[PDB]
Design a protein around this nucleic acid. Structure first.
Ligand SMILES: [Mg+2]
Ligand SMILES: [Mg+2]
Ligand SMILES: [Mg+2]
Ligand SMILES: [Mg+2]
Ligand SMILES: [Mg+2]
Ligand SMILES: [Mg+2]
Ligand SMILES: [Mg+2]
Ligand SMILES: [Mg+2]
Ligand SMILES: [Mg+2]
Ligand SMILES: [Mg+2]
Ligand SMILES: [Mg+2]
Ligand SMILES: [Mg+2]
Length: 180
RNA sequence: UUUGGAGAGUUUGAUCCUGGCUCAGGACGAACGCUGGCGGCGUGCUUAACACAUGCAAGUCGAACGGAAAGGCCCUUUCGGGGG
């Protein structure tokens, strides 16, 4: 079950002595909704070939987002190229809130509650590039604890560890129900 | 130890950056065009601190005093009125 979206379509032109040659391009976003995201950007002379190339590139490119239950861990300010994107965790039930491209990418990722805002470089390509850069910048609390070489409870707050406990309990319950 | 951030269009054969302009919401001590059944609730000179007809918007005490113009009572009557 792979989920796909299309953000924009642009008509590129090529000029020669004879006249004008045209081509099609598009960018696609693919995500499984369980923490998987991929960015694909393909070009072709027709929409079917373009979309096929884009989805193939998305299949080729893969990356795992370390989300905790429903929301992100810590605030992030990712800056890529001329695009800037900010992210912040939310209280449960608030819902997804962001611009077009940010909403598409985050939904394909599969989160439910998060804050976002775009401050420049409105174009979708740079927006998604900045968002994926921020996602790269995000880090896992277990990995940071291992790097620090200190006990987990001494680096993680009570709220976060409790939320992790409840998320693990719910995941175990869902797995048991599915197995049954 | 708790509460909460959305964008879109627009310069170029096609791309990006900065940056301008417009739109999606809420509010009025409001006005205008059209239409217009009823009940309940608030509100009604933001300009000329311009000029004003008119009728009202501050009186009360005889248990303070001198007194009885107009009333009541009792003495009188010619019904003009004479005393307390
Ligand atoms: Mg910068
Ligand atoms: Mg713009
Ligand atoms: Mg709030
Ligand atoms: Mg143009
Ligand atoms: Mg043009
Ligand atoms: Mg500037
Ligand atoms: Mg700008
Ligand atoms: Mg009418
Ligand atoms: Mg009634
Ligand atoms: Mg009224
Ligand atoms: Mg007067
Ligand atoms: Mg007085």
């Amino acid at each position: 079950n792979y989920i796909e979206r299309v953000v924009s379509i642009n008509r590129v032109s090529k000029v020669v002595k004879g006249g004008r040659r045209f081509s099609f391009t598009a960018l696609v976003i693919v995500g499984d909704g369980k923490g998987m995201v991929g960015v694909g950007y393909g070009k072709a002379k027709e929409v079917p070939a373009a979309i096929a190339k884009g989805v193939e590139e998305a299949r080729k490119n893969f990356f795992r987002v370390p989300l905790i239950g429903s929301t992100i861990t810590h605030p992030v300010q990712g800056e890529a190229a001329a695009g800037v994107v900010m992210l912040r965790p939310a209280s449960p039930g608030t819902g997804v809130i962001a611009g077009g491209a940010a909403r598409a990418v985050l939904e394909c990722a599969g989160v439910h509650d998060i804050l976002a805002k775009s401050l420049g470089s409105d174009n979708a390509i740079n927006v998604v590039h900045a968002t994926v850069a921020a996602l790269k910048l995000l880090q896992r609390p277990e990995e940071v604890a291992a790097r620090r070489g200190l006990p987990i409870e001494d680096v993680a707050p009570a709220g976060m560890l409790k939320a992790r406990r409840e998320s693990e309990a719910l995941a175990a319950a869902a797995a048991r129900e599915g197995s049954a």
